[PDB]
Write a protein that binds this ligand. Structure first.
Ligand code: CLA
Ligand code: CLA
Ligand code: CLA
Ligand code: CLA
Ligand code: CLA
Ligand code: CLA
Ligand code: CLA
Ligand code: CLA
Ligand code: CLA
Ligand SMILES: CC1=C(C/C=C(\C)CCC[C@H](C)CCC[C@H](C)CCCC(C)C)C(=O)c2ccccc2C1=O
Ligand code: SF4
Ligand code: SF4
Lengths: 139, 62, 747, 80, 74, 43, 135, 74
């Protein structure tokens, strides 16, 4: 699962709302070799600890805007979770342990078209059909 | 299509459709499917002037 | 230590970089690919914080560009004194400041535009100026046009002095960073040396040039008999029939000041507190005493901060001691840090200093506009009705642009110069930590006031149309009296010394000759309803601008907004659409709201003055106002603003063809063009326009006349900046041409 | 729930993956480039729609598209 | 008589903006270049940057000399 | 160096702001040509 | 043919010459408007007749359209001059005035220079060398 | 009379610009050099992001839209 001490943050207003209790809630988890201060994605500034840190955010763009901030503090070990309200913590970033910029094997060409972009079919080819013109199984 | 030659573009989806460009490099691997890199003298839209092309959509002018 | 440090010759002086435009940005110096390079060269020429990175080299560019700016004001200030010297009727106006109209700026005889040379009284043909220059030079003691000419010469050699000092402090002796960062020493010399010695120098001019000259001009010496101002100092017996309670000698007349027998000055340093009933302005004995109490208070307050002699205050310790062991217990909520780390904000960044110096200079220029109509300071200013309105309207617009600039650089500070290291839990961190509670309660009081100021104008508009004039918010129907503002008009007339300061409050009608200078401005339901239009439009102007300062770092939409920049169009069509999320596009939207706020301040002024203050007095005592009590009954419906103000008072700019007000009728209609022209750039987007250049580039590539600077449509930000630069130009020049055709058809 | 398709004009410069704020794209191995990579979008349910991967693609008439489709609660960026 | 002229000219301006609104929906949704090969409907798209370049000359002609001839007379 | 000065006065805004003071010859051709010059009244 | 009487015997134009100022704008340009056709309100109209205003309408055509195609031909022959020098990116901002004047005096005889490129086929660019869109 | 010459060239300016916006909306409904896949995005879409300079109002819906301001004006 997840664990860690929360950073020294004096409370905010841009934090979690009733969506985080009812639908989904994200959690970033990093570790720091320093008692440094960083900028919160929910507005303000907080002091991260020296052990395992743990911060609950509301949506995934707030975690990776924070994850792109820790990479400028030379902290590139963060794990992002997604916490459903029944307690199910899935682990979503980075999925394979490796960052999505550098290539790993076993990964799949998912949502890939084997044509140029300019040779997509016309929307009159797909008239009264279920598919869109960018799905288009020919080439 | 050698390096330094001037070539015209037959790609209808591109910015430089029927524009003369100078070939910069051709790949000798044979498995990259867009080997020839041609450099143009006008940028497309806030950006590049080089683009990878195939050899079947290029007609040389000299 | 507060010592001086400079740098000997840091920058060479050559025309080598004038041949390479765009040298300051690295992407602009590599060539002009498209026509966006043309516009980016001017949008970044003064962004000195992006040319370099170090604050030592930025602050030398700031300091040397102020000198080249001061050398631009001195060119314009030598153009106002030169036009009063050679192309004016200042001689004919000073002899008779009632019948002769103030005019400079004659027009050349070409293109038939000499119809603008109307008759100004006394055979002078020119344009009636409404800038108040003539009423200001009379208060300075100018009598002949030679003294105006050698002020315009003396400013041209002061422009070349200030222009030489910008070359000298960037190319020869440029200061270092620790010379700019002693702002305690700077406040000592600006309070005492600039604002204290400036109002000590001016109170020496007033009692030696202005107070003798404006005493003899009230007896009507008709500009032969008056002496030149050096003859009141070279001949000290000449200033003894005037002001006889003093001695007026070179050493013998000053010694009442040092022996503290200041009753010898009580005839030309008064505390009368009223308007001069022969001229209309304040007493120049009352003004000369005022600058002496200002120069004492500023030279005193310039010895507050600590320079290198130990004694004095330090702002570093005063800011860092406002934590919360030591506050008042009802405002002890601001942090155990307090605002430590805030002297490092206003010293290590010029955008933090510019946002305070613009909002203070903006709010000062509206306080100035509200005081020069109610306490008119110049002789024959208050009865020149074209000058009273064009000086209120000028400094309200000037002082409202600077407020929006004070909220632009309070947003460039957050995107660029904001540091979460030095601002942990201080008074600025704690504002961003609750910024959805500032904006929630601001967007409610903008909503509370929009219903209770504007929808009470729609209630009155419906009751007046229904034929129910007893059901609407009138002085005859449901009265809404300004209870707390009718009471302050009662206080400021029951605390009078013996003359009623500011006749706007009450008591007396100053009616110096012909027209009326000042009258009580009473407040009814039409003044309750219109002060809440002003309270509503100021709060939405704040709400637009404060939303761009607090949400300049991040939001719930884009949590990495400070990495996209200050001036960016959007973050794509995602999240439903995120156009105008930047901090720039809240300055852009707060410029329309500054416009709507200040155009109702100058419309409340222009109609309340005409109906309840200005007018003419007969031989009994009753006053017939310009529109005649029209604001009380008809300014409560906005069909009455349409009919009784915009339609009925534009009969002087509509019917201003074939006459001398002909240019105001053209600027009125040229103004309506630029407003409607602005809506091309505001309403449409650049993807239509870029896809329209491509069909026009084709017709040039066909005829082989295509350019290599490739034609691009304007940016998203650049297309919004030219849609607000035209709305705020053609919406101002159509009000400038209506305020001035209405009042220079009367006087 | 947008639709991020990726076409074979890719060059494997990884610039769309570094520009994505939500980790929708990732680099998989391929044979038709010198980098040997091509982008793929396995987390298209996290597509916020902002087309920031589209401004970073340097191929002319870019090799990645975002087709804005049926928007949901995580494809519209609602923290409430 | 006045309210019936202005009625039917604003109806006729709306019905002509919609005659070109569904021209655009026809090109997107209901046109294919393979079936309309070489006919009169491909020939318009073959030179469509010469119709837009000439509608933009008549527009640029009639506004430089209609606005300019008013504000000369103004 | 004064040899880079007139290489700046040949740039775009300079020669297209002296392409408006040279079109102050419409000021002189409408000063002494009794300015009213209609479309039938000049040959 | 029309009711546009000349301004000599128009009974509403002579009042514009009766009560008028003098200076330079309503005396000599007003007696030069006397040979102009004017309606029933004394304002000189511009009609199009066969021969009485044949060259009276053709002087504003031929005088303008020469120095309309004199600005356009010196701007076209300058952009073609700086593209054979292979420096057109930087010669369009910094105008090379020894060449722009040389391409101005080559455009002084442009009607006998355009038709030397129409019959030679060099005025227009051919359709397969011009950039277009997906059409 | 001459007051009717002038308004018919405003009417002609009006009918030509609002044809220009509608013909460019109809003929560039397939796509142009700013975005060559306008058919894949439908009739009414906002834009294609701030890339390639910015593409506000690029769709064929948003040119059947700027010509309602010109229909009402004319
Ligand atoms: C300024 C242009 C203009 C003018 C002068 C008119 C004038 C007229 N219209 Mg109108 N109309 C216009 C534009 C105009 N129209 C446009 C662009 C539309 C398309 C939306 C309409 C659609 C329309 C309809 C449906 C009807 C008229 C009718 C009339 C006639 C009677 C109304 C009247 O006395 O004048 C009053 C002043 C007006 C501005 C008339 C406004 C009428 C509005 C536009 C009706 C719109 C219906 C609305 C969209 C749906 C509301 C449903 C619900 C909320 C109740 C009158 C001659 C009525 C008629 O046919 O007479 C028997 C009628 O049934 N018109
Ligand atoms: C004729 C005298 C002269 C000359 C030859 C220069 C020349 C130069 N100045 Mg300059 N300057 C001058 C007078 C002069 N200045 C005066 C009178 C002022 C006061 C307004 C300034 C204040 C000034 C500033 C603030 C800057 C320059 C800069 C520059 C350099 C580039 C400016 C450009 O537009 O391109 C350039 C070498 C810029 C520079 O040094 O680039 C890094 C720079 O930022 N000057
Ligand atoms: C008493 C001494 C003194 C005086 C009179 C001034 C005056 C001024 N300063 Mg300065 N300054 C001083 C000391 C002084 N300073 C010290 C000790 C420091 C070091 C911390 C600074 C650092 C400083 C900076 C960084 C800047 C100024 C600026 C200015 C100008 C502001 C423009 C304005 O609105 O006012 C009125 C305008 C006038 C033209 C009044 C003229 C005043 C003259 C020069 C005084 C002497 C005249 C005569 C002998 C009497 C102004 C002329 C700003 C500026 O504009 O740069 C040029 C600015 O950038 N000052
Ligand atoms: C910067 C301000 C300033 C300056 C340059 C002067 C300058 C002068 N004053 Mg002065 N004065 C001033 C402000 C100033 N005053 C103020 C604020 C007061 C109090 C209101 C006075 C009240 C005063 C009196 C009563 C007299 C002077 C006089 C003089 C002249 C000779 C005094 C002397 O030699 O020493 C001299 C030119 C003397 C004079 O020559 O009268 C014309 C004279 O008797 N002054
Ligand atoms: C002391 C006053 C002051 C100073 C020094 C600055 C300085 C600056 N401002 Mg600024 N600002 C001010 C007042 C001031 N402002 C006010 C009063 C407003 C409200 C309108 C603004 C609103 C504002 C915005 C929205 C922006 C700036 C920006 C900037 C920076 C670059 C300016 C530039 O691009 O070159 C000069 C550009 C021009 C001269 C083009 C302007 C054309 C004018 C408006 C036409 C005037 C019409 C004329 C009367 C006819 C620069 C540091 C820009 C920035 O990016 O900050 C870092 C930015 O985007 N300002
Ligand atoms: C006259 C046109 C107009 C109107 C009515 C509004 C109205 C409003 N603006 Mg807006 N604005 C306008 C023009 C207008 N604006 C323009 C031209 C711009 C261009 C830059 C803007 C830019 C702008 C910005 C940037 C902002 C606003 C905001 C607001 C809201 C202010 C809150 C408020 O006042 O509550 C009062 C409501 C009114 C004053 C509307 C009139 C109420 C009527 C008279 C009562 C209705 C009676 C009844 C309920 C009708 C129901 C009948 C039933 C049959 C349906 C408000 C609804 C601000 C906001 O969001 O507030 C929090 C906001 O920040 N505006
Ligand atoms: C015979 C006439 C006719 C018909 C059958 C259609 C049919 C169609 N049009 Mg269309 N069109 C027409 C004329 C017509 N149009 C005209 C005259 C114009 C010029 C204005 C247009 C411009 C147009 C555009 C730009 C689009 C269509 C679209 C469509 C399609 C879907 C309609 C829709 O969106 O859902 C239902 C529509 C509504 C429920 C109306 C929405 C609200 C409107 C604006 C009424 C507002 C009036 C207001 C409330 C009244 C004021 C009240 C009072 C205070 C006065 C449909 C096949 C759309 C399409 O094909 O998508 C791919 C599309 O984008 N049309
Ligand atoms: C007063 C308002 C106004 C004015 C004058 C214009 C003017 C113009 N529009 Mg329009 N437009 C407007 C509002 C306005 N628009 C609004 C609110 C919209 C809705 C978003 C549109 C949307 C629009 C579109 C979609 C298009 C236009 C186009 C045009 C151009 C028409 C062609 C022409 O030559 O005419 C006359 C030329 C002029 C009036 C220019 C004035 C000459 C100046 C004054 C020279 C002097 C300059 C000097 C500094 C002073 C023209 C410049 C069309 C175009 O660009 O054609 C290619 C185009 O397709 N406009
Ligand atoms: C000398 C350079 C030059 C030349 C030969 C042309 C030639 C032409 N242009 Mg043009 N154009 C130019 C510069 C030039 N342009 C510039 C600088 C702009 C930006 C303001 C434009 C914007 C423009 C538009 C929007 C259109 C044309 C169109 C046309 C074609 C016919 C209508 C016309 O007379 O021009 C019109 C001229 C202007 C609108 C102003 C340009 C003239 C000034 C004085 C600049 C001259 C440049 C100077 C020598 C440096 C024609 C072949 C029309 C077309 O599409 O083809 C049929 C069309 O609609 N041009
Ligand atoms: C009209 C318009 C344009 C097109 C605007 C253009 C093309 C700017 C026009 C400026 C012209 C091109 C000035 C150029 C002058 C030349 C230098 C010629 C002068 C040379 C002589 C002086 C010799 C946009 O790009 C745009 C973008 C976003 C929202 C709205 C709009 C918008 O409304
Ligand atoms: S989409 Fe862009 S970043 Fe991804 S492989 Fe293609 S060129 Fe590289
Ligand atoms: S739309 Fe946004 S989140 Fe989705 S792939 Fe593009 S940049 Fe990434």
């Amino acid at each position: 699962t997840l664990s860690g001490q929360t950073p020294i943050f004096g409370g905010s207003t841009g934090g979690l709302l009733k969506k985080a209790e009812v639908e989904e809630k994200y959690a970033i988890t990093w570790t720091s070799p320093k008692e440094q201060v960083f900028e919160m994605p929910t507005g303000g500034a907080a002091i991260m600890r020296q052990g395992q840190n743990l911060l609950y955010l509301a949506r995934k763009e707030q975690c990776i805007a924070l994850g792109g901030q820790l990479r400028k503090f030379k902290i590139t070990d963060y794990k992002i979770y997604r916490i459903y309200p029944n307690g199910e913590t899935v682990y979503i970033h980075p999925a394979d342990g490796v960052f999505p910029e550098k290539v790993n094997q076993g990964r799949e060409k998912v949502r890939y078209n084997d044509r140029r972009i300019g040779q997509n079919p016309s929307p009159s080819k797909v008239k009264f059909s279920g598919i869109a013109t960018y799905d288009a199984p020919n080439s | 299509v050698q390096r330094g030659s001037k070539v015209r573009i037959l790609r209808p989806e591109s910015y430089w459709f029927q524009d003369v460009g100078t070939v910069a490099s051709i790949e000798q691997g044979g498995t990259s499917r867009y080997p020839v890199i041609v450099r143009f003298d006008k940028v497309n839209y806030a950006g590049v002037n080089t683009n990878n092309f195939a050899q079947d959509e290029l007609v040389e002018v000299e | 230590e507060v010592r001086v440090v400079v740098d000997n010759d840091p920058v060479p002086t050559s025309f080598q970089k004038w041949s390479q435009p765009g040298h300051f940005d690295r992407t602009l110096a590599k060539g002009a690919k498209t026509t966006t390079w043309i516009w980016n060269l001017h949008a970044n020429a003064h962004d000195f914080d992006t040319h370099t990175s170090d604050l030592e080299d930025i602050s030398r560019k700031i300091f040397a560009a102020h000198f080249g700016h001061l050398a631009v004001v001195f060119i314009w200030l030598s153009g106002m004194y030169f036009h009063g010297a050679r192309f004016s009727n200042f001689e004919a106006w000073m002899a008779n400041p009632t019948g002769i109209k103030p005019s400079a700026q004659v027009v050349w005889p070409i293109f038939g535009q000499e119809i603008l040379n109307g008759d100004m009284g006394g055979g002078f043909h020119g344009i009636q100026i409404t800038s108040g220059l003539f009423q200001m030079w009379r208060a300075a003691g100018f009598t002949n046009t030679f003294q105006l000419y050698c002020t315009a010469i003396g400013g041209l050699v002061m422009a070349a002095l200030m222009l030489f000092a910008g070359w000298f402090h960037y190319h020869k002796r440029a200061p270092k960073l620790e010379w700019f960062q002693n702002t305690q020493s700077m406040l000592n010399h600006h309070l005492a040396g600039l604002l204290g010695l400036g109002s000590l120098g001016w109170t020496g001019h007033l009692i030696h040039v202005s107070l003798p000259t404006n005493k003899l001009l009230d007896t009507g010496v008709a500009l032969k008999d008056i002496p030149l101002p050096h003859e009141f100092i070279l001949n000290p017996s000449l200033m003894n029939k005037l002001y006889p309670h003093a001695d007026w000698g070179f050493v013998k007349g000053v010694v009442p000041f040092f022996t503290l027998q200041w009753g010898h000055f009580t005839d030309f340093l008064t505390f009368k507190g009223g308007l001069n009933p022969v001229t209309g302005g304040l007493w120049l004995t009352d003004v000369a005493h005022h600058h002496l109490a200002i120069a004492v208070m500023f030279i005193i307050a310039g010895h507050m901060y600590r320079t290198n002699w130990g004694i004095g205050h330090s702002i570093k310790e005063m800011l860092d001691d406002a934590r919360t062991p030591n506050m008042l217990p009802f405002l002890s909520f601001i942090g155990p840090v307090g605002h430590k780390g805030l002297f490092e904000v206003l010293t290590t960044s010029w955008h933090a200093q510019l946002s305070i110096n613009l909002a203070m200079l903006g709010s000062l220029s509206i306080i100035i506009a509200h005081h020069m109509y109610a306490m008119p300071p110049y002789p024959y200013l208050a009865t020149d009705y074209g000058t009273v309105v064009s000086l209120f309207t000028h400094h309200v617009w000037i002082g409202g642009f600077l407020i929006v600039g004070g909220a632009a650089h309070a947003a460039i500070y957050m995107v660029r110069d904001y540091d979460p290291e030095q601002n942990f839990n201080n008074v600025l961190d704690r504002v961003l930590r609750h910024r959805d509670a500032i904006i929630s309660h601001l967007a409610w009081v903008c909503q509370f006031l929009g219903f209770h100021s504007f929808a009470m104008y729609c209630h009155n508009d419906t009751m007046r149309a229904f034929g129910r004039p007893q059901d609407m918010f009138s002085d005859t129907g449901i009265q809404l009296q300004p209870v707390f503002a009718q009471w302050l008009q009662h206080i400021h007339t029951m605390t009078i010394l013996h003359d009623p300061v500011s006749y706007a409050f009450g008591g007396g009608v100053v009616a110096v000759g012909g027209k009326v200078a000042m009258m009580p401005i009473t407040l009814g339901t039409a003044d309750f309803l219109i002060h809440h239009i002003h309270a509503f439009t100021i709060h939405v102007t704040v709400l637009v601008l404060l939303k761009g300062v607090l949400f300049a770092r991040s939001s719930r939409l884009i949590p990495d907004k400070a990495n996209l920049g200050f001036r960016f169009p959007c973050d794509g069509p995602g999240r439903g659409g995120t156009c105008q999320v930047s901090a720039w596009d809240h300055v852009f939207l707060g410029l329309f709201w500054m416009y709507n706020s200040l155009s109702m301040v100058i419309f409340h002024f222009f109609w309340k003055m005409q109906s309840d203050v200005w007018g003419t007095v007969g031989a009994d005592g009753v006053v017939t106002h310009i529109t005649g009590g029209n604001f009380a009954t008809s300014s409560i419906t906005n069909n009455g603003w349409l009919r009784d103000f915009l339609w009925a008072q534009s009969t002087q700019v509509i019917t201003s063809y074939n006459t001398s007000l002909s240019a105001y009728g053209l600027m009125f209609l040229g103004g309506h063009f630029i407003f409607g022209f602005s809506l091309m750039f505001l309403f449409s987007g650049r993807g239509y326009w870029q896809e329209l250049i491509e069909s026009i580039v084709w017709a040039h590539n066909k005829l082989k006349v295509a350019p290599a600077i490739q034609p691009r449509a304007l940016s998203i930000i650049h297309g919004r900046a030219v849609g607000v630069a035209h709305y705020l130009l053609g919406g101002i020049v159509t009000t400038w041409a209506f305020f001035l055709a209405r009042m220079t058809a009367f006087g | 729930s947008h639709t991020v398709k990726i076409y074979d004009t890719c060059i494997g410069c990884t610039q769309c993956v570094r520009a994505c704020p939500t980790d929708v794209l990732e680099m998989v191995p391929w044979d038709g480039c010198r980098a040997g990579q091509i982008a793929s979008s396995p987390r298209t349910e996290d597509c916020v729609g902002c087309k920031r991967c589209e401004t970073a693609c340097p191929t002319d008439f870019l090799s990645i598209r975002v087709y804005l489709g049926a928007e949901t609660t995580r494809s519209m960026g609602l923290a409430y | 008589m006045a309210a019936l002229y202005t009625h039917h000219q604003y109806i006729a301006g709306f019905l002509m903006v919609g005659a070109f609104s569904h021209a655009a929906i026809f090109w997107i949704k209901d046109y294919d270049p393979e079936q309309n090969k070489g006919n009169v409907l491909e020939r318009v798209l073959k030179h469509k940057e010469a119709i837009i370049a000439h509608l933009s000359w008549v527009s640029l002609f009639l506004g430089f000399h209609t606005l300019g001839l008013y504000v000369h007379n103004d | 160096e004064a040899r880079y000065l007139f290489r700046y006065l040949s740039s775009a805004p300079v020669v297209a702001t002296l392409a408006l003071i040279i079109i102050s010859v419409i000021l002189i051709v409408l000063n002494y040509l009794f300015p009213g010059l209609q479309y039938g009244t000049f040959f | 043919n029309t009711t546009l009487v000349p301004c000599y015997k128009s009974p509403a134009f002579v009042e514009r010459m009766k009560n008028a100022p003098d200076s330079y704008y309503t005396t000599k340009p007003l007696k030069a408007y006397s040979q102009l056709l004017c309606g029933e309100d004394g304002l000189p109209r511009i009609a199009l007749d066969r021969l009485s205003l044949a060259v009276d309408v053709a002087i504003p055509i031929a005088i303008f359209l020469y120095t309309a195609g004199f600005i356009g031909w010196s701007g076209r022959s300058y952009l073609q001059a700086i593209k054979k020098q292979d420096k057109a990116e930087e010669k369009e901002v910094f105008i090379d005035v020894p060449l722009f004047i040389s391409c101005m005096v080559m455009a002084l005889f442009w009607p006998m220079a355009v038709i030397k490129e129409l019959l030679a086929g060099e005025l227009v660019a051919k359709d397969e060398e011009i950039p277009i869109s997906v059409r | 009379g001459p007051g009717d010459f002038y308004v018919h060239h405003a009417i002609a300016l009006g009918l030509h610009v609002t044809t220009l916006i509608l013909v460019k909306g109809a003929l560039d409904a397939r796509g142009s050099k700013l975005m060559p896949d306008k058919k894949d995005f439908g009739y009414a879409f906002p834009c294609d992001g701030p890339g390639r300079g910015g593409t506000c109002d690029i769709s064929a819906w948003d040119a059947s839209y700027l010509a309602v301001f010109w229909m009402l004006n004319t």
